[PDB]
């Protein structure tokens, strides 16, 4: 749990080491040090996040802290915004090959969401080098 190349990073990989499942695992939040709810654990697994190790313990992030600090990083570290076509030209790759997370919940965008960004001419925001979009859940009236 000390060498990064040895300790697990993703939640499914971690669950095997403690001989538990994704169904009855107990995790704390890296920020507020409070136990994660079951739906919070499932969201952590679904949002493709990485386990953070501090003093040899596995830590996750709950929903409130994740959304709060995503908002703070959006406010404090916003660099610039670009269109989808400009981003594709700049990286010379299709939008499916890029890793774009939601600006509010850090969920990687599905190809349908990137297509919606392209069709609605919505801009992708560069936040401290991380390209961000906006998922379907966070973009509902």
């Amino acid at each position: 749990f000390q060498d990064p190349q040895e300790r697990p990073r993703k939640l499914p990989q971690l669950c095997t080491e403690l001989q538990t499942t994704i169904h009855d695992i107990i995790l704390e939040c890296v920020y507020c040090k409070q136990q994660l709810l079951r739906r919070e654990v499932y969201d952590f697994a679904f949002r493709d996040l990485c386990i953070v190790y501090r003093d040899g313990n596995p830590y996750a992030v709950c929903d409130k802290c994740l959304k709060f600090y995503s908002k703070i990083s959006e406010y404090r570290h916003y660099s610039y915004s670009l269109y989808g076509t400009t981003l594709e030209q700049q990286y010379n790759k299709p939008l499916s090959d890029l890793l774009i997370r939601c600006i509010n919940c850090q969920k990687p965008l599905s190809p349908e969401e990137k297509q919606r960004h392209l069709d609605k001419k919505q801009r992708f925001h560069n936040i401290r080098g991380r390209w961000t979009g906006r998922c379907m859940s966070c973009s509902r009236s």
């Binding site: 990073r9 890296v30 920020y31 996040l49 990485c50 953070v52 992030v61 409130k64 994740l66 709060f68 600090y69 995503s70 908002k71 703070i72 990083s73 406010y75 404090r76 570290h77 916003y78 660099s79 610039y80 915004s81 670009l82 269109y83 400009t86 997370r101 850090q106 001419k121 801009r123 401290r128 080098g129 991380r130």
Partner: protein
């Protein structure tokens, strides 16, 4: 001869046509062939062939004959109007340049036209052609610039003037305002993008020195909350690419910072008529967020003057200041903390340096993002809400105390009236960070300082080490003492016995002896290494002697200005005008933009009797007056016109002196009985303070 089976032209094959057409009285076949081959791109690619495939001299000499007759010129004028819209659509969709590098041969042939400068092309020929050359790919632009860098000063000046007059003409004729933006115009933007090409040709063609760079800037570590969030996202192993750099500066590999002496002075590329119609609040947004078809002129900062560029940096600082207000509101809402939206500083008057040092160095560790809040300095034992009045007083106080020769940080040269870093003082690294932060906080919070440095200081701040040629201002006597050494026509190793080891006096008065190489006194100075001794004496004086003092000074300056576009918009020459102000006191401009409130009007009896007293003030008394009302003795960027002074009425005729509200540049003037009484109180108010 029909002359209907030609597709390209060379020097001799057009000379023969001219010769055969001279004997007749028509001259029409020449017009027909010129309008047929010069109106088609495919004809121009293969025309005048011999990294370029067209001979410049052949194009230059043929144009000296074809433009002799008036009617032949009109063919060239009309040919460009027909050709450019094809090339604009050809370069946008067909992706032609990658197929053949000979497509660029089109634009060199056109750009060598002698009459492009003539006012007849400003209507429809030149604006459309600039649209075609604005859509070239980065590969074509980079090699096009290199060919133009081989021109001399006159050719570059002509090429620059071609696009300058188009920019002025499109602004003089049209009317731009807050609703009719300059950015959406398709002619100025294409002409400005085309003016950038000759700008980098001027940069490359001048004296370019690349390898004399400083160490990379020490990037500050973000807060622990941002570090923790990076590990969750899995992007903690890769860093941000860095500042936004012009994509044309990458293809060429040469930046404006490298160019020491360009072929043309950099101030000649500024388009003043463009600046007077530019809205810098809307231009900044187009710089950040890519809007549909709006072009931000901050992407070409060479075209903006000091006043306009200062506004663009102001908006970037203010927007970053607002974002720290939103975050503090969120912390009080969600986390239930106390609302503190300010970079509050509590300092004593007798210990300005000591108090501001233990507070700013603490913030630089616990909350490194607090330096981007609005500055709010309050003095201990005094009460008042600081709207800018106390910040101006604090900025004047710390500067006038840091540069005290008794503190030992800076040496004063009474001849050139400039300060230089003192390498003698040790263990004072923390203070050198304070003066670096204060300079950054002055730019960030928009206050001008009274700081006198040589231009080398503003060059090392931007990342360029001081070379020998920069010694003329820092150490004037050592420059001529070393210039004469190179200029000496006779032998140098015998007339004087100077070795490669130098002597320098200190504060203690003990001349220490420094060896540039391993052993100095063991090696004499010879003509072969005559240039080498200078290149190491200057390097030590400017860089090696004060490395630790300047490392902390540069580190502090970088903690406040790292994300600002300061390194993008300002050359080292323009940094001094930004940190400090202009010393010229144009009191006519101050009168023009002065507003009145509280009953006073522009043509009141006292107001008209007030402007007749200041206009008769001497140079010293004009400085005292500004220090009383503004808090600074200097004028802002531009002039006193930008200092929107306000005169407010303060009650009836009294024996109370005028009072000033320096936060908003407000002078509270009682309605005195006569003019002479006004002068006596005004003189007493500005002298005692």
């Amino acid at each position: 001869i029909d002359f209907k089976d030609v597709t390209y032209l060379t020097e001799e094959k057009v000379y023969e046509i001219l010769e055969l057409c001279r004997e007749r009285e028509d001259y029409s076949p020449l017009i027909r062939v010129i309008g047929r081959v010069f109106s088609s791109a495919e004809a121009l690619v293969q025309s005048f062939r011999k990294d370029v495939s067209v001979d410049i001299d052949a194009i230059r000499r043929v144009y000296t004959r074809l433009l002799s007759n008036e009617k032949i010129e009109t063919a060239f004028l009309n040919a460009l109007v027909y050709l450019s819209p094809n090339v604009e659509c050809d370069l946008t969709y067909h992706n032609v340049y990658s197929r053949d590098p000979n497509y660029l041969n089109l634009f060199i042939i056109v750009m060598e036209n002698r009459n492009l400068h003539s006012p007849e092309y400003l209507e429809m020929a030149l604006p459309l052609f600039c649209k075609a050359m604005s859509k070239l790919p980065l590969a074509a632009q980079g090699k096009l610039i290199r060919l133009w860098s081989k021109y001399n000063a006159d050719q570059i000046r002509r090429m620059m003037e071609t696009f300058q007059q188009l920019i002025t003409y499109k602004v003089i004729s049209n009317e731009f305002n807050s609703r009719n933006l300059v950015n959406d115009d398709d002619a100025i933007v294409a002409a400005s993008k085309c003016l950038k090409m000759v700008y980098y040709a001027n940069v490359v063609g001048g004296e370019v020195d690349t390898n004399h760079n400083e160490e990379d800037d020490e990037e500050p570590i973000p807060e622990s909350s941002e570090l923790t969030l990076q590990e969750l996202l899995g992007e903690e192993r890769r860093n941000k690419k860095g500042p936004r750099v012009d994509p044309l500066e990458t293809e060429l590999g040469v930046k404006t910072l490298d160019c020491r002496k360009p072929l043309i002075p950099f101030e000649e590329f500024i388009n003043e008529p463009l600046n007077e119609v530019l809205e810098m609040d809307k231009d900044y947004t187009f710089f950040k967020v890519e809007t549909e078809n709006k072009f931000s002129f901050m992407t070409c900062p060479f075209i903006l003057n000091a006043v306009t560029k200062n506004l663009g940096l102001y908006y970037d600082n203010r927007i970053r200041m607002y974002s720290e207000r939103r975050i503090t509101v969120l912390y009080s809402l969600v986390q239930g903390q106390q609302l503190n939206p300010y970079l509050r500083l509590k300092v004593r008057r007798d210990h300005i340096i000591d108090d501001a040092l233990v507070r700013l160095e603490m913030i630089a560790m616990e909350n490194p993002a607090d330096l981007k809040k609005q500055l709010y300095v309050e003095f201990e034992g005094e009460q008042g809400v600081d709207e800018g009045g106390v910040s101006k007083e604090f900025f004047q106080l710390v500067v006038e105390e840091i540069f005290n020769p008794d503190i030992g940080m800076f040496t004063y040269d009474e001849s050139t009236k400039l300060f230089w870093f003192n390498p003698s003082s040790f263990e004072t690294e923390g203070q050198f960070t304070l003066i670096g932060i204060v300079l950054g906080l002055a730019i960030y919070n928009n206050c001008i300082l009274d700081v006198h440095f040589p231009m080398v200081v503003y060059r090392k701040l931007m990342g360029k080490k001081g070379t020998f040629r920069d010694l003329g201002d820092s150490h004037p006597v050592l420059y001529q003492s070393l210039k004469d050494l190179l200029e000496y026509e006779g032998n140098v190793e015998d007339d004087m016995m100077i070795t490669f080891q130098i002597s320098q006096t200190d504060l203690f008065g003990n001349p220490m002896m420094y060896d540039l190489k391993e052993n100095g006194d063991k090696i004499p100075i010879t003509n072969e290494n005559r240039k080498e001794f200078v290149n190491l004496y200057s390097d030590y004086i400017l860089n090696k002697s004060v490395e630790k003092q300047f490392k902390a000074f540069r580190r502090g300056f970088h903690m406040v200005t790292n994300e600002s576009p300061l390194k993008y918009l300002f050359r080292p020459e323009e940094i001094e005008l930004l940190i400090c102000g202009s010393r010229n006191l144009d009191f006519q401009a101050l009168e023009e933009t002065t507003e009145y409130d509280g009953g006073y009007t522009r043509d009141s009896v006292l107001i008209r009797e007030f402007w007749e007293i200041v206009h008769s003030f001497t140079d010293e008394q004009k400085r005292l007056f500004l220090q009383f009302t503004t808090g600074t003795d200097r004028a802002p960027v531009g002039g006193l016109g930008k200092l929107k002074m306000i005169i407010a009425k303060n009650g009836p005729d009294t024996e109370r002196l005028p009072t000033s509200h320096t936060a908003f540049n407000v002078l509270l003037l009682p309605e005195y009985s006569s003019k002479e009484k006004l002068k006596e109180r005004l003189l007493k108010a500005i002298t005692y303070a």
